[PDB]
A paper describes a structure:
SulE, an esterase, which detoxifies a variety of sulfonylurea herbicides through de-esterification, provides an attractive approach to remove environmental sulfonylurea herbicides and develop herbicide-tolerant crops. SulE catalyzes the de-esterification of a variety of sulfonylurea herbicides, such as MM, BM, SM, TM, TrM, EM, and CE, to the corresponding herbicidal-inactive parent acid. The structures show that SulE is a dimer with a lid loop in a domain-swapped β-hairpin covering the active site from the opposing monomer. SulE shows a similar catalytic triad consisting of Ser209, His333, and Glu232 at its active site.
To elucidate the catalytic mechanism of SulE, we solved the crystal structures of wild-type SulE in complex with CA, mutant S209A in complex with MM, and mutant S209A/H333A in complex with MM, SM, TM, TrM, EM, BM, and CE in the range of 1.29–1.63 Å. Seven sulfonylureas bind in a similar manner in the spacious active pocket of SulE. In the other six substrate-bound complex structures of S209A/H333A, clear electron density also could be observed for SM, AM, CE, and TrM, but the density for BM and TM were relatively poor. Upon binding to SulE, the seven substrates adopted a similar conformation with a bend at the sulfonyl group, making the aromatic ring and heterocycle nearly perpendicular to each other. In the six structures of S209A/H333A bound to MM, EM, TrM, CE, SM, and BM, the ester O atom is hydrogen-bonded with the main chain nitrogen atoms of Gly78 and Ala210, forming an oxyanion hole. Superimposing the seven sulfonylurea complex structures showed that residues involved in the formation of the active pocket are almost completely superimposed, indicating that these residues do not undergo conformational changes when binding to different ligands. Furthermore, the aromatic ring of these seven sulfonylureas is also well-superposed, indicating that this moiety strongly interacted with SulE. However, their sulfonylurea bridge and heterocyclic moiety are not well superimposed except for MM and CE, implying that this moiety is not tightly anchored on SulE.
Numbering used by the authors:
A (entry chain A), B (entry chain B): 12 to 360
Amino acid sequence: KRKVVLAEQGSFYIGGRTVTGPGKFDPSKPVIPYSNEGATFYINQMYVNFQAPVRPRGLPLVFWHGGGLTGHIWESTPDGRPGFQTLFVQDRHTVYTIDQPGRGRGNIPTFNGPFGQLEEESIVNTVTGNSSKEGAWVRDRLGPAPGQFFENSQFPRGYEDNYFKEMGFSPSISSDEIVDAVVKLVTHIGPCVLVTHAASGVLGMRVATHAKNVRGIVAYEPATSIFPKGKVPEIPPLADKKSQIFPPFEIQESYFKKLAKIPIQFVFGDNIPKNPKSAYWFLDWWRVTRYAHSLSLEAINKLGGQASLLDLPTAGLRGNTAFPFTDRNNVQVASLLSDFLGKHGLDQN
Amino acid sequence: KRKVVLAEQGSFYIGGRTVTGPGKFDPSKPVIPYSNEGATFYINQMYVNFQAPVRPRGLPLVFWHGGGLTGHIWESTPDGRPGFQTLFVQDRHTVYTIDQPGRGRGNIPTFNGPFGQLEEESIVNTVTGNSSKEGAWVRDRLGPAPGQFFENSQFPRGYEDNYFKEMGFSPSISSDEIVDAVVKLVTHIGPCVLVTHAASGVLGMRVATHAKNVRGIVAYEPATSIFPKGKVPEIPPLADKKSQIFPPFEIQESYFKKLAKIPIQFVFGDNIPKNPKSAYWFLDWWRVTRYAHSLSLEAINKLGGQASLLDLPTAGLRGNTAFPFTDRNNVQVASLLSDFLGKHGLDQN
Ligand SMILES: CCOc1nc(NC)nc(NC(=O)NS(=O)(=O)c2ccccc2C(=O)OC)n1
Ligand SMILES: CCOc1nc(NC)nc(NC(=O)NS(=O)(=O)c2ccccc2C(=O)OC)n1
């Protein structure tokens, strides 16, 4: 069902700061080409979209895209099926979707001069990085190599171009400033639930430690593990005996303990190997990253928490990629998210 | 005023091309940091959002943001009132809103290396340009100088931070490729109406000459005038005796003549001076730019066209900025757009 009844919808900007150019602005002088003279620039602000149903129940959901992505991934699948935005408005939740600072409708901080440079100050780096189609194919576990699908894949085959077109670079905005923008949104919204993805997994955990309004977290395929400072457990290298997973983020235990106060679920798709896989770097990377997360969740539970790991194949769902919420079985994935919300009273007023 | 009922909503990517790096991709080697080796990159694609009401009447509308903007400006005003997207879904049109290539959820073409550079190929320039708050203030005619408002302004005063946060830079993607993406969208949609703004004014005129599915154009404060090649009229320099308006775009007459086959309306807000204003560069720029547009429309009409210029003050609306569709009286501005659609039957099936 594609029908949606909205009590209200819209979008707004929140967060960010300003930086200023030298000198002063004279309205008599030519304004184009643009100049940094007398300039105030708003930087690192975030775009926020909301849709509210009639008669909402439970807490609003904040959907937070993964690395190099935008709120598009919650709007629609690459083959044009409804995304989680529609599904959960239909499930009677108010739904927020964001484009974080540096992505999509969020701000890209650049000026008049080499990319990211304001006179002598580097606001973000001029040198960018960006995944290729090939890198994203194996990162997202469509298959073991570009152009090849796992036999069981839930990916919407035939819509590869549409899928990869949604991805792009991120400028070097500090993670602190990205977290700051979402903390400010959570302050504005009130009690809510964060639903994160890959790169935004660790960022959402950080937000919750700064914002008691976060009443629950569901993280799809989180990319970076988090631990109390000085208590990172032994994590093996990858099967190539050369590479490591992403260095785990370390926070003061007084902040880490806040994660034990809310229900947290990490969700993983399929085709993560059980055993070392030296021929396929990202598959092996996901094996060790998932392992590190299991230990992170265990640490939260030793502090009295309620942190769980859901492998979708254990729930009867086979073949999901690293984007289970846009896969062909996304309605079933959504049902499992509704189950988590219902278990924890997050779908009741 | 806020309730909206959608038969369906969603988003998708369209247009663009691919560029490739050197070499071959090896899935056994570390995928992060990302590399251009063996890489395929999707570049210059466009993001498209659609909202369809139940039982649409008349043609779909394609809202095309101005320079440095995104589809946000059609979603909500800076103070959170409904934008034209909501207003015209309520008016029973299917509504498309785009983020053009290079803006918002559209692609920003950059790779692993200095911004915009793929090995030895410069896809877009590493040196960017971007407006300041101060430049945008006078560009958009909030007032004659930053901090000042014209009397009777319809700007949503107090929401300056929200407003300027929606603006940003555009990489040097060729205008040809931006036009190409929207031609592809118009082919996909079928007969439609383009609603353009400032920088997308001339781009929408170009699309219409390439796409018979464009059945009408309403252009809010277009920034560049368009003429048949070799027949640009005499246009005076600005009052500073030094500057000129944007060089008018010239197209072959065979293509220009296609503009005479559809209704076209240019819409201007308030406070464009009638006489030279040497003290206020952008006010004088708008005076001469609007004059050039009056000549462009007269050229369309001499070829048998249906082109008109609507000054909102002549319709009884005073104080509009260069973004009349997000001003305080935007409902009244919308009513005038509904009037144009009804006059030409573009609101009937
Ligand atoms: C410690 C990080 O260091 C680092 N350095 C560089 N270059 C120096 N690049 C990166 N890139 C990413 O993290 N990519 S990623 O896209 O966010 C991602 C990665 C893994 C798994 C998933 C994702 C993801 O979100 O899939 C949607 N990371
Ligand atoms: C032939 C132009 O050459 C040129 N050169 C440079 N730098 C060398 N910069 C520009 N910038 C713009 O055109 N800005 S603009 O934002 O699109 C714009 C302008 C005027 C009026 C309105 C707008 C606008 O859309 O307001 C939302 N133009």
